[PDB]
Design a protein. Structure first.
Lengths: 1337, 603
RNA sequence: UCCGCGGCGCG
DNA sequence: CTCTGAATCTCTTCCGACGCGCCGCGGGACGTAC
DNA sequence: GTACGTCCCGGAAGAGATTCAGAG
């Protein structure tokens, strides 16, 4: 079962594993992120309305005035997209908000407000999303990349080893809020608790606890358990629990009930513990020396004297024991403090602190926060209540609260945005337990601790910044308010929010420039995960663990695609099936398996809960019932790989394609290739160039259809129907009967995009691929874009290739190309350049653009009109003039005597645009921008008349076609219920309203048709008026410029020795020499080969997949030429039908199972004709074809089975003694031309700071001689050349003038002098107080 | 500098000067009215902070800032670092009369000359063209010269050809590493838009042809030309400045061709004949009547220099191969015949070239070098060594070896479930058994690939060395080693995880067959680790090289003989096993300190 | 206008 | 108990490769009159 | 709206504070 346009060219596919979930909407991240920010979200959640409800409601300083929020609405954009990129204005829309201001009277704060006022006010402008998912800021399209940042919540790092150089690992626990000040705890070699705030100086931990209204006894009770001592009449009896004696050191004989249990000098045994549990011993006698190390917790005060006997947290002594015993105390409570079970960290920290008063703690905090300021109670209280417990400055997000709760094993996963005392005390307790040895540390690289942002979140954050700025502004303005004498628009201003949004969208580390020259390039650019940006890492502070891939990266982020160089592993790309969870984590699909049956329903798993379960591999065979054919299947439980039983798994992979990203998944035979060359080949594939005539790729992956459809490049059909009128400019579709709306059905109209400037100086064009009378179905390709063909993705071309070393012209990686390749004109690429001329305003008068130019003759003016603008179609080369632009420098200072002196022997001067030297081409379009109030020349009038004619003819044709279809629909409806074959159309269709007929659904349907006809004609008149007014008016430009002339050159670039060509496996190389056709080797059949590679690279660069690809291409052409031979003779359809059927079965159990008995004879004839150029073959990434299928398919053809064919030589003409390999490989052209890096300079401009030549190519400069270059020259005996080169040719001015004069005279002699850059250093170092000078000669 | 618009892009120094002078003027004004001490002290402290900021910004806390956040620069910042004068504008400065492009091969050139594109040829040498044109008197002024050079008539190309005949130029690679990073050639005009560079030089530059860019320079004055002609040719750099081995060693292709040249097979057409001299061996070979490599007895007349500077002519009948005679056609007179009787790999040819240089002089060495390069390309092209997909024969015992290893690991695991073994020792044991299986399968694959060929020898049967394309390409020494062929044919062994330990499951699939997903995923770890390491290591090495080079800048040899008697005792190193380096490669090229005494003491 | 900052890319 | 006093711990600075090619933004604000 | 005045991450190394070790 296939649709009609899939019947044009069916792609044979291998494979055995049946897929269950097709590729989703591949461009979903940007769209589903942005369809939350500009949406009217009811009741408020993660949107603009939430931001307003968060910041907007404001109450003045008891001024009885309040500014609340009501609603918002976005108006229609002023300009469409096309006008936006053609002019230069942002594709934005106004943001209307309804605001309420209330002012109350006296004596009551809570009652009903006396007076209100409501109105609509304007504020800011928001950039929109085009349907391609991209942004237009300033005449330049730009793309936003999603950012990967550090997840909010509590985390336990460890800092292995490095600190203190002693092997004692420390432990820190930092809390990273979503917005606010940080907070972290850590240890010391002294084993103390320390608090730090925003990396400032170290403070003890107990200060916060004391400031939170906790007494010392409360702290000790919370952080430690309790033990009781009871002073009986003899030896201070003690209450005992047997389970606490694990690992404690004994000091005497433990006995109970008059029975000895533990021997003096020995330690407890497990059997002794069992015995103690058997006897339920509770109270034991204790010697006085056993209490020689316990510390009191709470204070004891004498009732009689009224003093303090023992203070909190100090060790007791014998004298203190006697005092407390004689004071009448019976219950004595102290600490546990074992060596291994519970460290006395809290006790020693409370000992080491200098202060023990909450007001003192607040004083310490206040002085720490703001040094050098007298503290006071109110300021400290406010500051502490505002740092952590204020809604304005500290706020955890819902994700932050969820993770914070999860890491502490609480129950309710919902809470407020601020923290509380329970949270901090639980964090301290968890840290103590982690130090104690229970629990485990948490690593960072795990994807369960990382979060992805997108456009919406960052836009909301910047917008909130703008609103907080305007909020403090309106507060300070309302603090001096008045009784509604002003209307609520003065306080609100469009400066701050607009400035913030413009700076974010224009100048940010994540609003990066679009790099588009291929559909794949944009399919892989918008799906990018950058680890840089605000709030993220920096390039120079990235270690190795952040670059290496964690074993939890399987199926979420690509492991093999990343830009090589300074930043590897930070620009990783998202996978194919991967999505975004609601909170923001990454997840991938899976299949839930029952005990024996693999159910087809899909479950989503995040990056945390997957480790608990066990996951089987995708590439495991299975039966029709889902039972695993083996009793053991390899799986992964916790980052490992092992073997498990028949029934212990709970989830299954969806398909074998989910491990890679879209960038590298297009490389056939990937599983036979090394990772390095796969990465390189993906990088070259990302950076191809459009070709003049695309050709289908012979060996594909069966995925090109999705990547071609989902990119914003192909005009995919919206609603099904049949084509009615096709043209190189527009396409019209007649709608089918089952897909019409009840009203205003009509027919669809499209508009192709012709030759226009691209963004990377390439050319994007659209050619219609649909015939006439060909019906179409919904969601189908009609006209292909650049590097596309019939809905497939065709980057380069396929050519016959052969492997051998040939006379050294393919020495190490060079390639030789026969003249046949350029003969067929199949590597020509089109490049479009934009040249601008500005008409600024300077002193002494403005400049003139007329053609009146002196110092040149008819040779330089034959290509110009009267206005001074080149005609359209004038073949221009290097050395002509495009616009005659002259600057009147002036200062003529005419004199009756001295001026005629200049004319005795033998003002405004030219500043016209100059063609780049070396590039030919033809001008295609000239566009002019003029400031309003300036006289337009003749050419501007003609151009605007041309636009008016084009617009009016377009609208007229649109009305003509639309109403023709409308009246055809009227006729079709009228065919039933009172039809008049000829009586209806005696007089033209303009009057079909006075028709006498019965009133039914048809009659009022026609009435509705006429009503919408009238409405349409009115609306078309209105918008024709609006459009002509819009196009006739002038346009705003930059300040100070008079007019702008835009001219487009269109150079056609051929192939030439120096260009870079590369395959799809990383075997790049630059072509070396072009050869006549006779010289390349030819086979016995007679056909010559086209490209000869270098076989030497295969051992080292172990990319064995290229050989397999070559053999597969040979097989494809072996089928294709056989079809060609069968087609050239006018043979009947049965033989070709059976041949194609045999070609399609040709293998083991596959998923295609196509049949030809359901094809029309015309359809199969067209399929055969379109298949004459070879058979495309689809191969999955990790489910490809083995060797046996290749051998069998070659056996289907007459080609040799071994894959090596004997070959002859062209020069000498004898057989090679060893046969070689030939076949068809997909060869690409990269965007590194040779006429872009070639450069030379004799003597150009000089800089001003130091008289040295400039740098770069656009600036006419020369190359740089570095310091290592100087060392290399010094390593020889080189003396004169070094001095000469860095003295005369570079710095000295008199020296180089003298050298020039001498060279033009035929002598060669040098005067060194002294370089002036050293003189610059002299002056600069003299600019300080240092006395630098040069002594005698 | 005024830019496009009504605003002026002010420099940081100007703003700092304005601030300091404004504060000074305000303080001068304030003291006139005898202000209270507090305010004048406060403004003085402001002035002092400002002048410190101007003199050195960022040394004190709260560094001043400019437009939005970037700290403004100062003179101290203008001297330091890569953005300062010393290391960016004084030691290395941009020079005119230069150009750059991409490189191609053009293997038909001789090694003392290089190609150069026409456009750069016209653009670089414009002053010379002007001088010659004025001497020949085709222009009264310079403006006519301007029109003629910009119009490039037919009268200027002959002049350009005349001025280039003997004018050396310099080539350069951007990340220059050693003293061979700069060399001079004799340019030869060529069409196109790229520079052709001789392939044999390409080994010295460590430059492939994947888009490398070379920068050209012109020595202008007369002494520069003479110095470049005396020291800067490739002909005067035949030995490395780091070691005594030649640096013009054949790299990749010619070595492969020559290794194909000499490997006699037991049976080929044309066996058992006698030839007069090498000059007719080619006559037989090119007529198709004798195979390229076959046993044959020929007469060879080599010249040897046992006598005092004169060459001795001796003749004999040597048993050799036809290809060896064809190569004997190209050897100079000095070398004895016993040097081309072996397989003639890469080390052998390097040593042979070295001894040719050591014995015969200099000029015959360079002539032999470029001639051998020509003939190597020619015969490698004739051979046509192509890699095929059936050329990788998998050993048939691999499956049974894997089965045995899996049975052993299964029984070890079962013993682990018996509670008799710990974790670390079984870990080490399974690693050991996997290593044993790896080396065993590697040995089996090497054994059944390197000598699989068997021939009837015109008799019953005989076993000879194999002519497999991949084995021949890997054993020559052109590119590859045992590790790469082992990885490509046998199982790849044990990969490591970022923790540094070894994953318990080896990869039991070679590149010829398929790979499972996790097997690829594990190797991704090593690939990424290697790429990151090679990214950072070059950055470290550059800084280390600069630190070494700055300190030894001033040591220049100035005297011919100090005249001392103190030396260091030199002995070969013995680590505790076989000798690593003998006296031959450690004492060579040094002067004796004390007289060497034979164990015939007092001799 | 020749400079600075930022991003991307190739050796 | 007291004085050195050598040893130790902690705070502050400098340093991290070298050639290119493409593109985009940049004295801005804040008030004072004109 | 605009011209104009004022303004604004290790790693290595050393210097300095601490410390406690031990002799007098
Ligand atoms: Mg390279």
């Amino acid at each position: 079962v296939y649709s009609y346009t899939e019947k044009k060219r069916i792609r044979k596919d291998f494979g055995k594993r049946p897929q269950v979930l097709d590729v989703p909407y591949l461009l979903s991240i940007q769209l589903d992120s942005f369809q939350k920010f500009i949406e009217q979200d009811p009741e408020g959640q993660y949107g603009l309305e939430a931001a307003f409800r968060s910041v907007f409601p404001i109450q003045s300083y008891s001024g009885n005035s309040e500014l609340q929020y009501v609603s918002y609405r976005l108006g229609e954009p002023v300009f469409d997209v096309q006008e936006c990129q053609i002019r230069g204005v942002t594709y934005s829309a106004p943001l209307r908000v309804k605001l309420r201001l209330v002012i109350y009277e006296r004596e009551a704060p809570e009652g009903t407000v006396k007076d209100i006022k409501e109105q609509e006010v304007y504020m800011g402008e928001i950039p929109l999303m085009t349907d391609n998912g991209t942004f237009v800021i300033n005449g330049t399209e730009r793309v936003i990349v999603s950012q990967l940042h550090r997840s909010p919540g509590v985390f336990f790092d460890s800092d292995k080893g490095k600190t203190h150089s002693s092997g004692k690992v420390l432990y820190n626990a930092r809390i990273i809020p979503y917005r606010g000040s940080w907070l972290d705890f850590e240890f010391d070699p002294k084993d103390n608790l320390f608090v730090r705030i925003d990396r400032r100086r170290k403070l003890p931990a107990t200060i916060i606890l004391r400031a939170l209204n906790y007494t010392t006894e409360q702290i000790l009770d919370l952080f430690f358990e309790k033990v009781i001592f009871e002073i009986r009449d003899n030896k201070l009896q003690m209450e005992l629990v047997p389970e606490r004696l694990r690992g404690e050191t004994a000091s005497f004989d433990i006995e109970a009930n008059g029975k000895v249990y533990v021997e003096k000098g020995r330690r407890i045994t497990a059997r002794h513990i069992r015995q103690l549990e058997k006897d339920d011993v509770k109270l034991i006698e204790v010697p006085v020396e056993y209490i020689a190390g316990k510390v009191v917790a709470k204070d004891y005060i004498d009732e009689s004297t009224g003093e303090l006997i023992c203070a909190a947290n100090m060790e007791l002594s014998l004298d203190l024991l006697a005092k407390l015993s004689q004071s009448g105390h019976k219950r004595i409570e102290t600490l546990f403090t074992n060596d291994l079970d519970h460290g006395p960290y809290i006790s020693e920290t409370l000992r080491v602190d200098p202060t023990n008063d909450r007001l003192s703690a607040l004083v310490e905090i206040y002085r720490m926060m703001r040094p050098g300021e007298p503290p006071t109670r109110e300021a400290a209280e406010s500051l502490f209540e505002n740092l952590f417990f204020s809604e304005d400055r500290y706020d955890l997000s819902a994700v932050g609260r969820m993770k914070f709760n999860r890491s502490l094993l609480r129950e309710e996963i919902e809470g407020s945005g601020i923290l509380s005392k329970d949270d901090i005390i639980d964090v301290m307790k968890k840290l103590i337990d982690i130090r104690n040895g229970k629990g485990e540390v948490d690593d960072i690289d795990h994807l369960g601790n990382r979060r992805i942002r997108s456009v919406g979140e960052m836009a909301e954050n910047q917008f909130r910044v703008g609103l907080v700025r305007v909020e403090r502004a309106v507060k300070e303005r309302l603090s001096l308010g008045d009784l509604d004498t002003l209307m609520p628009q003065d306080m609100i201003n469009a400066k701050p929010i607009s400035a913030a949004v413009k700076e974010f969208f224009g100048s940010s580390q994540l609003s990066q420039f679009m790099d588009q020259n291929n559909p794949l390039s944009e399919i892989t650019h918008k799906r990018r995960i950058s680890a840089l940006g605000p709030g993220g890492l920096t390039r120079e502070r990235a270690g190795f663990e952040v670059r290496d891939v964690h074993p939890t990266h399987y199926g979420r982020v690509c492991p093999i695609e990343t830009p090589e160089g300074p930043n590897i592993g930070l620009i990783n790309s998202l996978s194919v099936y991967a999505q975004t969870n609601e909170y923001g984590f990454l997840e991938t699909p899976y299949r839930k398996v029952t005990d024996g049956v693999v159910t087809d329903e899909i479950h989503y798993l995040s990056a945390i809960e997957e480790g608990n379960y066990v996951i089987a591999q995708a590439n495991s065979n299975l039966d029709e019932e889902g039972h695993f054919v083996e009793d053991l299947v390899t799986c992964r439980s916790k980052g490992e790989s092992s073997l498990f039983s028949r029934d212990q798994v709970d989830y299954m992979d969806v398909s074998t394609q989910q491990v890679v990203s879209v960038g590298a998944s297009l490389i056939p035979f990937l599983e036979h290739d090394d990772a390095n060359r796969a990465l390189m080949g993906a990088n070259m594939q990302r950076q191809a160039v459009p070709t003049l005539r695309a050709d289908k790729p012979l060996v594909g992956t069966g995925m090109e259809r999705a990547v071609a459809v989902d990119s914003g490049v192909t005009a995919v059909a919206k609603r099904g129907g049949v084509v009615q009128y096709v043209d190189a400019s527009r396409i019209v579709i007649k709608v089918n009967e089952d897909e019409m709306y009840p009203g205003e059905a009509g027919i669809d109209i499209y508009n192709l995009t012709k030759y226009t400037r691209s963004n990377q100086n390439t050319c994007i064009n659209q050619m219609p691929c649909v015939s006439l009378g060909e019906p179409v179905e919904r969601g189908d390709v009609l006209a292909d874009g650049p590097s596309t063909d019939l809905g497939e993705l065709a980057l380069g071309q396929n050519m016959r290739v052969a492997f051998m070393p040939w006379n050294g012209y393919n020495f190490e990686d060079s390639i030789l190309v026969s003249e046949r390749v350029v003969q067929e004109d199949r590597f020509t690429t089109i490049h479009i350049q934009e040249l601008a001329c500005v008409s600024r305003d300077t002193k002494l008068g403005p400049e003139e653009i007329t053609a009146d130019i002196p110092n040149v003759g008819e040779a330089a003016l034959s290509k110009l009109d009267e206005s001074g603008i080149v005609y359209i179609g004038a073949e221009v080369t290097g050395g002509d003039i495009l616009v005659g632009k002259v600057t009147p420098k002036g200062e003529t200072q005419l004199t009756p005597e001295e001026k005629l002196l200049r004319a005795i022997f033998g003002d405004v001067k030219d500043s016209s645009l100059r063609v780049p030297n070396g590039v030919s081409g033809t001008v295609i379009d000239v566009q002019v921008f003029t400031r309003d109030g300036v006289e337009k020349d003749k050419r501007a009038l003609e151009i605007e008349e041309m636009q008016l004619k084009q617009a009016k003819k377009d609208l007229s044709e649109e009305l003509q076609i639309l109403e023709a279809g409308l009246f055809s629909r009227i006729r079709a409806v009228l065919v039933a219920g009172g039809v008049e074959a000829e009586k209806l159309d005696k007089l033209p269709r303009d009057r079909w309203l006075e028709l006498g007929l019965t009133d039914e659904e048809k009659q009022n349907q026609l009435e509705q048709l006429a009503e919408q006809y009238d409405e349409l004609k009115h609306e078309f008149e209105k918008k024709l008026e609006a459009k002509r007014r819009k196009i006739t008016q002038g346009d705003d430009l930059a300040p100070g410029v008079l007019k702008i002339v835009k001219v487009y050159l269109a150079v056609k670039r051929r192939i030439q020795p120096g260009d870079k060509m590369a395959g799809r496996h990383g075997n790049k190389g630059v072509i070396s020499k072009i050869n006549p056709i006779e010289d390349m080797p030819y086979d016995e059949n007679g056909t010559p080969v086209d490209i000869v590679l270098n076989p030497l690279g295969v051992p080292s660069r172990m990319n064995i997949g290229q050989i397999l690809e070559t053999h597969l291409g040979m097989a494809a052409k072996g089928i294709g030429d056989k079809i060609n031979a069968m087609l050239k003779q006018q043979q009947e359809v049965a033989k070709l039908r059976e041949f194609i059927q045999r070609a399609y079965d040709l293998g083991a159990d596959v998923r295609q199972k196509v049949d030809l008995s359901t094809f029309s004879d015309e359809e199969v004839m067209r399929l055969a004709e379109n298949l004459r150029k070879g058979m495309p073959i689809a191969t999955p990434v990790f489910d490809g074809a083995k060797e046996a299928e290749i051998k069998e398919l070659l056996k289907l053809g007459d080609l040799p089975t071994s894959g090596q064919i004997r070959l002859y030589d062209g020069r000498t003409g004898e057989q090679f003694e060893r046969p070689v390999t030939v076949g068809y490989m997909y060869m690409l052209k990269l965007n590194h031309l040779v006429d872009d890096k070639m450069h030379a300079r004799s003597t150009g401009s000089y800089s001003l700071v130091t008289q040295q030549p400039l740098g770069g190519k656009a600036q006419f400069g020369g190359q740089r001689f570095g310091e290592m270059e100087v060392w290399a020259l010094e390593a020889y005996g080189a003396a004169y050349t070094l001095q000469e080169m860095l003295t005369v040719k570079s710095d000295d001015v008199n020296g180089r003038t003298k050298m020039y004069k001498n060279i033009v005279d035929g002598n060669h002699q040098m005067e060194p002098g002294m370089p002036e850059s050293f003189n610059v250093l002299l002056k600069e170092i003299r600019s300080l107080g240092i006395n630098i000078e040069l002594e005698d000669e | 500098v005024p830019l496009d618009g009504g605003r002026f892009a002010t420099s940081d120094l100007n703003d700092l000067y304005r601030r300091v002078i404004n504060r000074n003027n305000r303080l001068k004004r304030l003291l006139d009215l005898a202000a209270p001490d507090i305010i004048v002290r406060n403004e003085k402290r402001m002035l002092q902070e400002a002048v410190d900021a101007l003199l050195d910004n960022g040394r004190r806390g709260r560094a001043i800032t400019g437009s939005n956040k970037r700290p403004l620069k100062s003179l101290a910042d203008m001297i330091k670092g890569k953005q300062g004068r010393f290391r960016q504008n004084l030691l290395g400065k941009r020079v005119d009369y230069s150009g750059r492009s991409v490189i191609t091969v053009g293997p038909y050139l001789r090694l003392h000359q290089c190609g150069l594109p026409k456009k750069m040829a016209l653009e670089l040498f414009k002053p010379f063209i002007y001088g010659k044109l004025e001497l020949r008197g085709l222009a009264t002024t310079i403006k006519a010269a301007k029109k003629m050079v910009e119009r490039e008539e037919a009268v200027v190309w002959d002049i350009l050809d005349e001025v280039i005949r003997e004018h050396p130029v310099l080539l350069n690679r951007a990340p220059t590493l050693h003293r061979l990073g700069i060399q001079a050639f004799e340019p030869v005009l060529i069409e196109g838009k790229a520079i052709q560079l001789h392939p044999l030089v390409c080994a010295a530059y460590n430059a492939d042809f994947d888009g490398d860019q070379m920068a050209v320079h012109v020595p202008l004055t007369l002494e520069a030309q003479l110095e470049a002609r005396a020291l800067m040719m490739s002909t005067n750099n035949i030995l490395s400045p780091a070691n005594g081995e030649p640096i013009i060693v054949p790299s990749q292709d010619v070595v492969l061709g020559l290794y194909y040249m000499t490997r006699d097979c037991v049976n080929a057409k044309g066996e058992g004949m006698v030839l007069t001299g090498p000059k007719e061996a080619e006559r037989l070979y090119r007529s198709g009547l004798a195979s390229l490599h076959a046993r044959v007895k020929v007469r060879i007349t080599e010249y040897e220099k046992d006598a005092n500077g004169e060459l001795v002519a001796k003749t004999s009948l040597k048993d050799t191969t036809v290809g060896r005679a064809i190569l004997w056609m190209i050897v100079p007179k000095g070398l004895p015949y016993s040097i081309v009787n072996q397989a003639l790999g890469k080390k052998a040819i390097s040593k042979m070239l070295n001894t040719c240089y050591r014995i015969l002089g200099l000029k015959p060495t360079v002539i032999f070098a470029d001639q051998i390069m020509y003939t190597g390309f020619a015969y490698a092209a004739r051979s046509g060594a192509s890699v095929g997909i059936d050329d990788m024969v998998i050993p048939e015992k691999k499956h049974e070896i894997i089965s045995e290893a899996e049975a052993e690991v299964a029984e070890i695991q079962e013993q682990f479930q018996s509670g008799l073994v710990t974790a670390g020792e079984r870990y080490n044991k399974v690693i050991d058994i996997w290593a044993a299986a790896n080396d065993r399968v590697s040995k089996a694959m090497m054994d059944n690939l390197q000598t699989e060929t068997v021939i009837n020898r015109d008799g019953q049967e005989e076993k000879q060395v194999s002519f497999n394309s991949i084995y021949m390409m890997a054993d020559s020494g052109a590119r590859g080693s045992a590790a790469q062929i082992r990885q490509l044919a046998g199982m790849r062994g044990l990969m490591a995880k970022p923790d540094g330990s070894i994953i318990e499951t080896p990869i039991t699939a070679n590149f010829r067959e398929g790979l499972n997903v996790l097997q690829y995923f594990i190797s991704t770890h090593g690939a990424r680790k290697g790429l990151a390491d090679t990214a950072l290591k070059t950055a470290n090495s550059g800084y280390l090289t600069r630190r070494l080079v700055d300190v030894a800048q001033d040591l220049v040899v100035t005297e011919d003989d100090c005249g001392t008697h103190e030396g260091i005792m030199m002995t070969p190193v013995i680590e505790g096993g076989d000798v690593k380096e003998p006296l031959r490669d450690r004492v060579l090229g040094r002067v004796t300190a004390e007289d060497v005494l034979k164990p015939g003491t007092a001799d």
